[PDB]
Design a binder for this molecule. Sequence first.
Ligand SMILES: [Mg+2]
Ligand SMILES: [Mg+2]
Ligand SMILES: [Zn+2]
Ligand SMILES: [Zn+2]
Lengths: 1362, 96, 338, 48
Amino acid sequence: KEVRKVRIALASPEKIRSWSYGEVEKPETINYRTLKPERDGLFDERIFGPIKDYECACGKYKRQRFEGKVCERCGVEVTKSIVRRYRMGHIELATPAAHIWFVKDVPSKIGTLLDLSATELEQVLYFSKYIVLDPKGAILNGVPVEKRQLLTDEEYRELRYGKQETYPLPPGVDALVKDGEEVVKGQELAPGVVSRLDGVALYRFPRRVRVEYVKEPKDYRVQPHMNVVVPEGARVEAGDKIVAAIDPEEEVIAEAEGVVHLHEPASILVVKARVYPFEDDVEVSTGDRVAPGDVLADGGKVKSDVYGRVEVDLVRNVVRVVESYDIDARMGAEAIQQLLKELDLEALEKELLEEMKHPSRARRAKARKRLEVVRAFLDSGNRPEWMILEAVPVLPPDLRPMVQVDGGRFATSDLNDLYRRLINRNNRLKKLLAQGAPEIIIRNEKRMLQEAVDALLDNGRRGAPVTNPGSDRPLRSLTDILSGKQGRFRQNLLGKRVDYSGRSVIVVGPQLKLHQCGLPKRMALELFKPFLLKKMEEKGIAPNVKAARRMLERQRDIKDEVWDALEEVIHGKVVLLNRAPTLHRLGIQAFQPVLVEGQSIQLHPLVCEAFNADFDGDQMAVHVPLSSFAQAEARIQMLSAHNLLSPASGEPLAKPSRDIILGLYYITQVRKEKKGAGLEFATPEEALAAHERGEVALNAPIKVAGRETSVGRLKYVFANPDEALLAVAHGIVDLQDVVTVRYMGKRLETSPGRILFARIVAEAVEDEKVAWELIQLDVPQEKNSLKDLVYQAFLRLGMEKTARLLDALKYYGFTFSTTSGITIGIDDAVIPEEKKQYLEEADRKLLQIEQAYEMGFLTDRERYDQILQLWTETTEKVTQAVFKNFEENYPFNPLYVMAQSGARGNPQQIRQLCGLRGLMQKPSGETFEVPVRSSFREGLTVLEYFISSHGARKGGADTALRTADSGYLTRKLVDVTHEIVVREADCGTTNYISVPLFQPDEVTRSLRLRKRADIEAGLYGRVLAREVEVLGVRLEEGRYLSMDDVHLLIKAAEAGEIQEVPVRSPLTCQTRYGVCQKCYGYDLSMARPVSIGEAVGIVAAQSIGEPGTQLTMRTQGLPRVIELFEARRPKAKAVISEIDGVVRIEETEEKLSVFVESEGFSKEYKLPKEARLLVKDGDYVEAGQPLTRGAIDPHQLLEAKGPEAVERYLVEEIQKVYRAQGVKLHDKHIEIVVRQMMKYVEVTDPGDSRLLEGQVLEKWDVEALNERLIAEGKTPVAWKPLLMGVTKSALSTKSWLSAASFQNTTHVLTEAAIAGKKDELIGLKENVILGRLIPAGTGSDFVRFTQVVDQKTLKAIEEARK
Amino acid sequence: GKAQFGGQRFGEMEVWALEAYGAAHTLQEMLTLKSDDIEGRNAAYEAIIKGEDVPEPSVPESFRVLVKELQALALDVQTLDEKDNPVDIFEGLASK
Amino acid sequence: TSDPVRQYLHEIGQVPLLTLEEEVELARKVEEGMEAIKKLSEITGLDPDLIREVVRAKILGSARVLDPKTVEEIDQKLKSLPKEHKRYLHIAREGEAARQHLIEANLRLVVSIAKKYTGRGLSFLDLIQEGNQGLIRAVEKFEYKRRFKFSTYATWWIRQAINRAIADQARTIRIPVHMVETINKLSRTARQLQQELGREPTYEEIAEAMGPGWDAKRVEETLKIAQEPVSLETPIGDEKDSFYGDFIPDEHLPSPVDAATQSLLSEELEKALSKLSEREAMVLKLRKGLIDGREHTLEEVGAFFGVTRERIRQIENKALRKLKYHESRTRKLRDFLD
Amino acid sequence: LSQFKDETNPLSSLRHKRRISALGPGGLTRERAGFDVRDVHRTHYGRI
DNA sequence: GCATCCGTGAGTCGAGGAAGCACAATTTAACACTTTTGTCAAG
DNA sequence: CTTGACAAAAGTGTTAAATTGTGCTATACTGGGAGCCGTCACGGATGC
Ligand SMILES: [Mg+2]
Ligand SMILES: [Mg+2]
Ligand SMILES: [Zn+2]
Ligand SMILES: [Zn+2]
């Protein structure tokens, strides 16, 4: 069968014993000399199976013939050794031990069921306070003892063994109270010591005995080794023994008849007891417990009158009943187990339902939590008493191996040590119980057993972590194995090490195609080793596979035909290149390997930006897909030439880069001269003749008669591009000169470089007209123009022609950057003549400010602010001067060309190289008053360098502490939206979102058109929900909005015809466990409608998390994004109006108050004094509209306006941060993540359902329950929308596997085990953990069952069937 | 590690990239056939050296270790089928 | 509460220390109770162990988990005895109670003894509990007639129990007590020689100093045995992202190459055996274990085919020679021999 | 703090002997350290 | 409504590997002797 | 195809030597030692 669901539930002791093949009774692991496992040990062959396949311990059966047989001599079953990895054991605990996962995991589930606090549960479990299970008529301090009452050690001893005290008398003094007399509290016993409790007083050690002979008060002295054997006031006849001693020589006897009197006791024992004299034999014995009315002695004549412990004193021959109660009080996990057994879940559920109606909110919340736990136990079918372990399971020994390394040393895991400690403590407890150890020792050993069980289950959670003696390293328990970044889930389940994988340093390959990479010969031989062996076997290179492998083992034994065979193997196959970190989905790309001589991987330049890979020492990994499915997926979906557009924004990602852009811009830029630059003539011949006279330059802009042209456009008229480029080759004209060409029947006035670029595009796309329509010939080719050209080529031609154009552009750009002559010199950083003047003006203004400050016209703070403003203005002016100097005097300056073309550098860096470094910041954040007036070309001073080092180190630390946060946020986004897949073509929903085209600017307080980039990010590749009529164009419902449609909508908005665009979005998608094709829109990586089965959730998470590193960190930047995704309450939260109305300001010196007034309601908000109010008197504010500048609390906005408003606010605020950094990200991803955030609701009115008020569930589930209740006429469940962060939403998912593998593994696992949650394997993480086919991509049910058949076989089937 | 002649770590982020591409079969191979499916990897190697296609992969050993450790934590982890009947992924080797 | 040792010390601090007189009376009561149990067993004829267990269960009360019904029956039988025997029953009960009190009141002594044995592979509380076991044994064997205080006799048993527990439970791989003593003596001798010579001694000097019957080889083997196993989870590196288990290959399960070559060898052998006759191939498979069973002897195969041993040997040799001829003429099976 | 010596070149060992680490036993930790310890204080002039 | 203790989390690769002593109960190396073949002559 | 003689290979039955495990030391000892520390933010109960 096929695994479809995974169920986790509590394991009963009977089930645990059923799992085990035998009880592990000894802690011995292996023998030290023979190295064989010891019998009944942690590694016993009799329990966990044989060490080697088909071989018993006794060495009698050694073959597969006796398969499934258990040897009679040794007991080891004759089977495969691999069962050693799968056969478990069990340890039968002498006393029950509570599972720590159900004790210290707040809220304590056992405590929740028993209504016991964490402290009380810890005290009871770890033997600190007793708990009563049967009072047995016990009265404490005048209050009868009730059940479930906690008793300390003193209280338990008082109730169980009675009250007793010992007062030690000083030597020599005689007690004032006779032996066997009742005394009251405060009564003096001896002259130096007084009693503290009422009871019978007894002599402990009489030091002197005073016998009164009758014929003589003879006295005898008693020593510690002598014991009196007669009572006080007893008649002793001559010869009777009086005092017994070790030596009969010193034994004291009576000479004649007398009366024995005891005197001088060592101490007095006062016990709260009743004394009964007796004459005949007693019916009871010492240690028993009696009740009033019970017979004690004399055959019923003497009857007990009070509960207590009975003890017979033969010396005084009386029966003492100490007043005590046979109270049943216990500690440890046995009492907890008994209490959980006694619970009736039905009665508890009924009581909790009754209590749920209490008006108190805290009472209702507590009842809801307890009732949720009870309902989980009831529905799961588990028993509460299963939470306390009676038999501890034992992991198979191969999962905790004791291996022998090649060096002879033994390596073992910490689980062996934990099991050894547990077994030792259990056996010691068994021995102590068998030996009748006292209560203290037994209690201590039971506490040790409980602590050992806790350490085995989860080490370090409670108390000091258990460490191996001789070191302070905590032992690795099962919880530590299964939790954390180094746990099983994140290290061996979600990610694994793979075979057929290599790694090497990458180098740039310009000669490679976009779909090719340079795989080294040795790496290809090692990675394709099995295929190479098969190919060598096919040919005559080797006789068989073994000979081929032996040949390949030695480097000098490899012939020359092996390389030819390897080349034959890799024909058609592709390999996956990977570079860590894989920030987005293009970090792994399929390339067609090309064998190269060397050891470094050759990487195509164009994909480098996709890989975020430079060639300063990067390393990349190579993986080899094996089967036909993997090869088809790599060649069709994962191919580098097939992923030309970025899925995040839809713009091209494999586009011309630094050197390519530099070369194309250099050739496509025209020359501007200044020789003539204005001279006007009458006829063109005059201008030409002046040109040969040298008065005017070739490219100098002149006027011939009325029009403005140049000498080049008149002197050089080329009939076709071939003649122009032939003249360029001969050196008559340059690529940067402006001449007249006849292209496509049009007399253009352009440069031969631009005509050459047009020809390049035409030859690359093999279509002159389309290529002409794609390019813009009137501007130099910068990065943006090349990107637009690539996108237009992708739209008009397809992937293959776009890849060909990309390769041609790369080749030509590289060649022209090589031959153009771009170089960086110290004089290329031109110092403007205006910098000195600006610095002098700044110095004069600073001197004026200082003089004014000395005059007292301004204070320190505003003087510092003015200095900062002055220096910022000076820096901006210097930047403008630098760029004006470049664009006027040196238009082809390498720094200017690189900055303008976008190949490298930004205006700030060009300023630092050419202008001034500027202001710098202190480590505390303040900026230095004096700036760094010297640039890098002039050279900084030591002090200026030290000042700049502060900012440099701050930026480095910011990047270091920001990369981890960005990665963790990306992990959260992946784990919360891992289940989102395109699962159907259309869900049929009628809801939508109105994307606004106008933003309400507050400085003008009016609607202004948003930026084109924002509208494109919010509308490109989206399905129109409603038909839109703009500019005579009717976009029907269900039409995908392309870039042309977005531009048309933008133009219509500019014409004032449309205010907002209604589009279908994932927020309004009704598809369960995913989205629909018509709601997602285009697949931005292909500029076509999304294919059904794509994992859009993972794509969205990666797209959002990739530019997290680029966001500035320094409520702004990446922390703002994090607090937005987590729905955290901002510290400087804004104040919003809960209800709509007219605003009224009551600003007073005492307090600041804002009133929202309505027809019958009036709300008051007490604002802080330093609040930047953005609303004035006489304004109409709506519900949720902010009143103070700041960050809106998402929960307050959701509760004030509604789910749509809070979703829109979240999307807009998240997108604002990316806009501020220049990163273009489509709103689909943010909307998907927000939809995942808004997936949960809270029940307010249970209605006709079993749900509880305040319970949090999924919106889809409650909607289904509501429609089901409506179908058969029942009161619907009232629910309130709930917003939670990505962490809380991911942790509360229905599938326990993904939640456990994400975070809080212990809590998720314990909740799932208690509730018996069954994982349906809906998302992608669970299938990854189980290694199944994920329900996305080729594994989606929509396309998984597609069948391909030829014509002939299909016709045969039809003919043979019909 | 190169010194120990080990493979390349295919961590979580690479799995996310494969899921984003939708390469379900490649991801399954890299999780089972090429990593820890003992019978699966042995059969795949035998098929490749024989010129045949690799067989369908099976349950990884890592999931078996997960199940056994969860059982050692006294948690009953059971894998079910469409009809909710228990499914033995250990091929009867752990059944008494 | 958080510190188990603190809680245990607080618990043992609630039992006042025994004076000399109290110690003597408790020891005398224990001796008298043992003698009374002996007399009761002699008279009633019951097992002394059974009577002692019944008396101990009655003394400890019902707060303890043989079924209690037989304990009650035995107690009723003992109480049915006349007064001269109920006297011994009461003496036994008082002796058991005194034994419990005496054991309870000497926990400070065992704590003080065990505080000097810490750091030898066992935790403090484990040493305390093993010393408690030794203390119980000492109370069982203590005699007050010799007039020696209880501490003097109890210390021997407590330290003996602690040392035995350290020898038997401080190592993951258990080593017998005699070998533990040998290792300890070897370590002491090595340390003494090391401090005497001012350098680490070689095995020859250690063996010479140990005594007769010891050589360098035996010292080396003893040191090799005394090597504690190394943990598989010891981190290596500044970051806590590596462990020993990540560098130890698994050499038990066959590698994919090994399984592949085994399958290839099986297929080639099956193809080669096709050239043999039907009977010869079956005989060779039976004689070489190709039927997954142990190689059947000549007599077993002969009885299976109803043939004598000599003919089976002859046909097996002839078939082996034919296979050798085929291999020589083909050479398609030599590479698998290695 | 006892690190395996880096002696690729004499300058390597010379720098390694003159390194100052805020980590180690009793010191800070890689992921327990904020911006306060990682910044260049004004007193680092001429000393670090 | 708020101060406070507790628990959980904080990027990816790679390259870093301190007694002895006596005495009885259990195991096993060393042999000695039948038992069982593996093979060889006899055709 | 069979019918007897040989020459080891393995198993059975003692034999003590080696190894292993439990019992016993009688002046008097009567409550532990190591920590110990530079982080922030966010649930979430725990009380006042
Ligand atoms: Mg780099
Ligand atoms: Mg001309
Ligand atoms: Zn066996
Ligand atoms: Zn939809």
